[model samples]
Target: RPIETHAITVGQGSDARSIAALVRAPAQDERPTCIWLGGYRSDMTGTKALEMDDLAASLGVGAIRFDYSGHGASGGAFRDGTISRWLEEALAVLDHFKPEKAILVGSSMGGWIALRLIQELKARHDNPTQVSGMVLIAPAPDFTSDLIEPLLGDRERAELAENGYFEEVSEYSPEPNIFTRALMEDGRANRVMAGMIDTGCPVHILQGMADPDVPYQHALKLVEHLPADDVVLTLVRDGDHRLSRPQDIDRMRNAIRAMIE
Candidate 1:
């Protein structure tokens, strides 16, 4: 099938898990497939995702990028989500368009989903045997429970517990940042860095030294846990959380190219 945009329901919850995805296939040549998993509140058409798609198209390599359920054009409420649900959506995308060997490019929280995905796919013997490596950009594997929740004061905790929802000022947007109780409770169950992560897949982490959200140390911590001796962590001195600048995008492109070749 020629690469194109489509909608597919990954699963059934209170409503169907619908999503928007962009796929670019290798140009009449056999090449590795790349699946781009976007960060929280980020859609598939973001700057980095588009640049990578353009590059993949030029190289005649397959690339796929999608919106998680409740984000962008996908169905569901963003605040009503958990890591596990998002993971299911990603697997559905993978299953829909089977690729020979795929590299997962996960950004921010998507990185956490990608790690669990590696574990899930490895367990399934009948599933498509692909997934070669991973590229993580400012990976926030367990920030919700490990960082965000703990930072809340006792009064904030009581408010969330009593109301089932809490509103915090968002630094990025003017809208009141909403966090549902379900999300916070679910996050506690999915912390990845709590122990050793021994995935043998080649892993690359790109972290910005001046990032305010996820510290550069978290990347080092993640590298320490990865079982792959081939893992690399790249730190850009002037890079920030978004990492969408021209230089940063070039760095990401280089990392993806390295993973494949």
Candidate 2:
């Protein structure tokens, strides 16, 4: 079957924005839908995200890959981005698709969002969608507090207080990354590793030992917090943060397959 592109609008009033998504409809009585929750600055067009859509296409499972508001084809100002705002958009996206069952494939900051999604979805009074499985790639659970805040230098801190945001050179982009003070502060409210996380579904974590962005130890901690769920951790000694290499991509595809079969 062919994949369909959708423009899903979230929020209202002055805050209204449209999220761009590519969805692959599934064959009847297929496996759970594969939903992509990409990293910061990542869009649906990334290598890993595309790999997910391809896997769904080949397997006959539904797949959804969307750009968060302000991130890619979506509409919004990047400067106004925050975890709360993005979470709202994610929920809207999921509600629109209304997957009967889903396997969340989350990367980096998207890991944090996925965790929150599970929490929120499970808490709904009349829940229609069930997250049956999860695949986290170099997941950054509490990145703002555990990863970024602890490493902020005097210069970064000064810039945060002075300009409300600090810019850092990005290896992926010609333009520097804008880390707003609003986002950093909002991370506290959205932190998932603070307590027990009962996903109530199987979770597979793929972490790269060489990943400088998110340490492998963090995934261990995230695993530790998930004592209530079925969890497995795979460590790639040579893999970088993206984990998008063909070999790395193979591991992720295999992990998602494991969840199904």
Candidate 3:
């Protein structure tokens, strides 16, 4: 039951998959769709996701937003998930409901997934439905392996390897979220900046200069591997990881409009 207008539960699979989506389109026909890849522990109903949908509608564009398998209304256990599983879910949504040329709008972890998707599409389709461009906000391409694992103390790393689970301090949540060894090991396989990424599309990366989780330098690293010469990086001096402040939101909106145009 994918809605043509607003946010709602769109589809349900067997016990294995249940998806909820928010779709906003200028018309029922094909147009460049903006597919939102939300961050870990976040859902499609966030302010940024909704605002982008409204922006798409006003501009006669199309937008698709959804939750990951275990988060929000989707079915599965959050702990039992991996990067591959979530990405498969994203692809299914694209193939079923929003099979149009798309400009991927990926936030944080979503940016990582989008990079992988670009490679997959390049290999499969000839003159494929265009992934016109990418808009990445506070992009963390390999956080679990590159950032999180390296930051873990000796005791934490030892526990992760031995007990298969480790708890790290969370800035946002009071309780520490468990990080499984499998997640850390699997993340190593999805590193994007480690090699050349032939995403033959313009990329616009918005990074908060003050972001604690992902440094501005990370965004600079991402720009290096992008084969596209038109990649742009905008560093907000006072912005944080969320980039949800009034001024930050305006910057994101402006970037999206520019990419589509």
Candidate 4:
């Protein structure tokens, strides 16, 4: 059976969708809350997300995990997904959860969302929530424009021009992954690595040298963008994209712990 979860609706008719989420309350409302942002095509039930919830329980800090629209138990079609669309739901979840102090933990595409969330919050004059820290695992900040576009071959380009989307095999799932032209266009508008980023908090990045989807160099690129903030980069020699091994999870836990305290 699917996990029983709370729902938060976002957007208007035709664009409206309900986001599924699980909130783990803190023993006391004193410390920072953990807000988990998972990767592309990934849900709140993934290995890392579950571990994070457990960590939150152990620390007595509140935590939240949610599925983006079109992902996991959330309502929406994956074909309509884009950076802007998913970010909107993320904002809605944050507004609903109303964490006074938050430590954003993000994996892969979630990393991008976390960063964008910071930017959006910063732009707000009366932003009440304070992001205390960020933990990004294998962050792909601008994969659509920076990573995927440069590598699109003529055949894929032709297909995108004619079909509005293209498909590639997903190692994590039985279903093939889809990339749409709309997502690409929206990615350009959401690009963040182009200039300096002020996250207003310390950042910890855990990347794997063996990650096929996002190269380790991308993390280095991201570090360069955060010129003023306190940043730490941990590269695993034999780590893959998942980074779900016991040791890997421990490392992430350690990083998050360090960020928390």
Give the C-alpha lDDT of model 2.
Answer: 0.89
The TM-score values for the models, in the order shown, are 0.94, 0.97, 0.90, 0.96
* Structure candidate 4, residue pairs in collision: none
Winner of 1 and 3 under lDDT: 1
Q: Which 10-residue window in model 1 sums to the lowest lDDT?
A: 22-31
TM-score winner between 2 and 3, please give it. 2
User: How well is each residue in 10-95 modelled by candidate 3, as lDDT tens digits?
Assistant: 33454366677767654645568888999888887898898788778777888888889779867777876777777777777777
Considering every candidate listed, which one attains the maximal lDDT? 4
Provide the lDDT at 178 for model 4.
89
Ranked by TM-score, the better of candidates 1 and 2 is 2
Instruction: Give the alpha carbon lDDT tens digit for every residue of 1-261 in model 2.
Output: 788889988988999998898888779644689999999998889899989889888888989888988888999999889988988888899899898889999999999999999999988899889898999999988788998898799999999999999988888779988899999999998988888998989999999999978888898899889965479999999888999888999999999988766
- The candidates, ranked best first by TM-score, are 2, 4, 1, 3
Give the residue spans of candidate 4 off by over 4 A. 1-4
The candidate with the higher lDDT, 2 or 4, is: 4
User: Residues 228-257, candidate 4, lDDT per residue (tens digit)?
Assistant: 658999999999999999999999999999
TM-score, candidate number 1? 0.94
User: lDDT of each model, Cα atoms only?
Assistant: 0.83, 0.89, 0.81, 0.91
